[PDB]
Amino acid sequence: HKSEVAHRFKDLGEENFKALVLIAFAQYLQQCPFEDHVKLVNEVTEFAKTCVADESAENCDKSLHTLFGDKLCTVATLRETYGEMADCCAKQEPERNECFLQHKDDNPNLPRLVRPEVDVMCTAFHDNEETFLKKYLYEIARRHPYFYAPELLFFAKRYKAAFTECCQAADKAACLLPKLDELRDEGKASSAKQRLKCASLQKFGERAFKAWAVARLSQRFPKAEFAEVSKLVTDLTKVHTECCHGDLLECADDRADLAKYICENQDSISSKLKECCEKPLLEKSHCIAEVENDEMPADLPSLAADFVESKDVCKNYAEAKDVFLGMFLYEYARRHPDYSVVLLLRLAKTYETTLEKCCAAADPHECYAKVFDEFKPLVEEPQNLIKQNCELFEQLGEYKFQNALLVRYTKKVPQVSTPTLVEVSRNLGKVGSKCCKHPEAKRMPCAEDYLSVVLNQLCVLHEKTPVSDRVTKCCTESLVNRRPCFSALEVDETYVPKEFNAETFTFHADICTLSEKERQIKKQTALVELVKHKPKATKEQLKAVMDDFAAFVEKCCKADDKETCFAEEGKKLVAASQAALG
Numbered sequence: 064h065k066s067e068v069a070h071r072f073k074d075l076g077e078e079n080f081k082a083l084v085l086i087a088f089a090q091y092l093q094q095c096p097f098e099d100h101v102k103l104v105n106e107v108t109e110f111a112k113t114c115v116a117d118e119s120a121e122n123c124d125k126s127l128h129t130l131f132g133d134k135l136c137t138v139a140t141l142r143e144t145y146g147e148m149a150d151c152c153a154k155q156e157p158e159r160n161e162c163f164l165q166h167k168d169d170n171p172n173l174p175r176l177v178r179p180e181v182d183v184m185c186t187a188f189h190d191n192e193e194t195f196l197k198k199y200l201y202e203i204a205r206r207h208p209y210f211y212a213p214e215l216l217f218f219a220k221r222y223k224a225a226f227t228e229c230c231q232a233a234d235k236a237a238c239l240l241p242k243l244d245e246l247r248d249e250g251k252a253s254s255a256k257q258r259l260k261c262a263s264l265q266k267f268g269e270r271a272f273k274a275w276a277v278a279r280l281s282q283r284f285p286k287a288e289f290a291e292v293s294k295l296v297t298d299l300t301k302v303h304t305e306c307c308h309g310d311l312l313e314c315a316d317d318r319a320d321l322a323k324y325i326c327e328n329q330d331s332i333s334s335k336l337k338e339c340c341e342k343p344l345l346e347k348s349h350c351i352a353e354v355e356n357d358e359m360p361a362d363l364p365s366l367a368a369d370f371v372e373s374k375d376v377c378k379n380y381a382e383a384k385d386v387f388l389g390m391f392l393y394e395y396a397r398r399h400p401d402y403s404v405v406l407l408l409r410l411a412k413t414y415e416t417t418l419e420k421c422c423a424a425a426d427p428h429e430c431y432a433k434v435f436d437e438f439k440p441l442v443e444e445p446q447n448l449i450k451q452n453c454e455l456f457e458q459l460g461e462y463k464f465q466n467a468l469l470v471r472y473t474k475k476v477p478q479v480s481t482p483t484l485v486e487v488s489r490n491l492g493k494v495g496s497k498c499c500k501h502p503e504a505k506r507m508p509c510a511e512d513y514l515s516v517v518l519n520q521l522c523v524l525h526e527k528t529p530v531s532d533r534v535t536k537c538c539t540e541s542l543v544n545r546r547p548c549f550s551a552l553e554v555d556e557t558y559v560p561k562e563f564n565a566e567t568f569t570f571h572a573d574i575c576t577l578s579e580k581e582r583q584i585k586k587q588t589a590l591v592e593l594v595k596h597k598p599k600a601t602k603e604q605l606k607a608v609m610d611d612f613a614a615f616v617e618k619c620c621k622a623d624d625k626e627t628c629f630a631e632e633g634k635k636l637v638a639a640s641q642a643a644l645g
């Protein structure tokens with residue numbers, strides 16, 4: 064186009080343009096106040112209207128990176144608050160924009176965004192609605208810089224739907240709090256999911272990411288031919304390559320072009336895209352990525368007719384090992400939408416290792432005749448782990464299930480810090496809360512997706528604090544081996560039990576008057592130090608104690624005398640559990 068700003072101002076809208084421009088300058092100017100960005104956003108949008116009224120006005124034909132970088136150097140505090148980033152303004156445009164992406168700080172040093180009371184949020188949301196959503200959007204963007212700016216706009220529109228519906232209701236906290244926590248746990252999961260694909264691209268190479276894209280696209284698009292899925296995997300690998308680079312316009316255009324090809328080839332990809340392709344350009348890439356798995360033709364035959372019993376299997380493989388193996392991922396994923404994508408890569412590696420061993424023998428057909436028999440143990444292993452834990456989640460509650468995990472995983476790796484073991488077991492319990500509530504045809508894709516972000520969060524906290532060698536080995540291993548590595552952990556026999564500290568196992572009358580979240584944290588934090596003090600404690604002993612602690616809380620909180628009860632009964636509970644866990 065003759066003017067980049069005029070075009071993007073048209074096919075996005077003025078309300079969407081000012082929002083993205085705010086997120087743009089918030090991720091680069093993470094130290095300027097909110098009033099400065101509003102000054103810049105209003106100066107940019109007023110300039111954008113000049114190019115809409117005339118495509119040949121002052122500096123309208125310039126590039127967006129030039130207009131973005133020109134505004135980036137207008138700030139006077141650029142030399143003081145960022146300093147080194149101000150040096151980028153002395154380079155040419157193809158390097159200046161590259162200079163700005165490097166000096167972007169991933170993890171700044173800002174306070175946490177404290178969630179205030181519902182009354183003060185519904186008053187600010189009602190008094191001045193626009194600046195309320197923009198300020199908090201400016202606070203999320205300045206703390207998550209590499210977050211995809213358009214996708215961050217999709218969450219802000221969801222928050223707006225939570226206030227308009229709940230801030231005029233009965234107990235607004237009953238309407239809003241289960242929604243803000245939903246949007247937080249989902250928003251933090253999206254921030255960690257896209258950050259994981261960048262690590263998996265530079266650690267496992269370009270080939271490993273393509274195998275993952277082959278298995279998920281063919282799973283999502285079973286009616287698509289292998290040539291069409293292979294074409295999409297190449298474009299998909301290019302998108303996440305340049306989106307992880309840090310550039311917004313470079314990543315926004317690649318995703319927009321990919322969505323246009325998918326919408327122009329719905330007859331050879333999927334039939335579920337009618338609704339997604341109706342949406343405008345901003346929502347195309349987001350809708351398509353979350354489209355439901357299409358139905359398989361159901362008339363598909365077995366895989367032994369082309370990969371086992373057929374002739375020239377070693378010939379079709381040796382001619383192109385990556386093309387032949389990718390078909391095995393294609394032909395197996397679209398016939399198993401219930402398998403996790405990581406599980407399908409585990410089967411293809413089994414098929415890959417078998418062909419490299421059988422085709423080097425005298426009689427190949429007799430060798431790999433049992434290649435499909437090796438898949439059943441690898442497939443039953445995650446299915447049985449889903450069955451064991453979901454049945455445990457059916458008996459116990461969600462809270463009682465978290466404690467079962469908190470005891471099981473503390474005895475395996477007792478060296479991990481207590482606050483880490485708590486947040487892990489509670490986030491891990493949230494996985495079974497919604498994945499076990501799905502049928503068996505969706506349990507493994509659910510568990511794979513949430514375990515991927517929870518296990519990676521564990522490895523992030525363990526990377527900045529080396530604690531256990533067994534945890535480091537599982538965090539360093541491959542993608543198909545990461546989750547089985549954690550499931551293969553056993554009880555640490557070399558662990559010396561931690562010395563007793565009475566201050567930890569002392570409880571005061573404040574737990575009678577804490578929120579349900581704070582109460583569950585303290586009951587579980589004390590359960591970790593209880594196991595770390597006596598790791599060889601059997602479960603029947605822990606059925607007690609925890610029941611003696613249940614009566615200890617009901618005896619002190621309900622009595623007319625508090626604080627004093629925690630001193631008398633607190634000594635009885637501790638000392639009785641001393642001889643109970645002998």
Ligand SMILES: CCCCCCCCCCCCCC(=O)O
Binds near residue numbers: 130131311346
């Ligand atoms: C002057 C700052 C400009 C910041 C970027 C404004 C235009 C963003 C366009 C985003 C298009 C998204 C396409 C897509 O993901 O489907």
Ligand SMILES: CCCCCCCCCCCCCC(=O)O
Binds near residue numbers: 274385386415541
């Ligand atoms: C042109 C399409 C190429 C698709 C290549 C897929 C190859 C998958 C082989 C199995 C990979 C298992 C993971 C690994 O070996 O690290």
Ligand SMILES: CCCCCCCCCCCCCC(=O)O
Binds near residue numbers: 586587589609637
């Ligand atoms: C030897 C120290 C004894 C006192 C500490 C015991 C800690 C028990 C924690 C119980 C947590 C679960 C409570 C519940 O079921 O709601």
Ligand SMILES: [Ru+3]
Binds near residue numbers: 207251254
């Ligand atoms: Ru965050």
Ligand SMILES: [Ru+3]
Binds near residue numbers: 303352
């Ligand atoms: Ru993606």
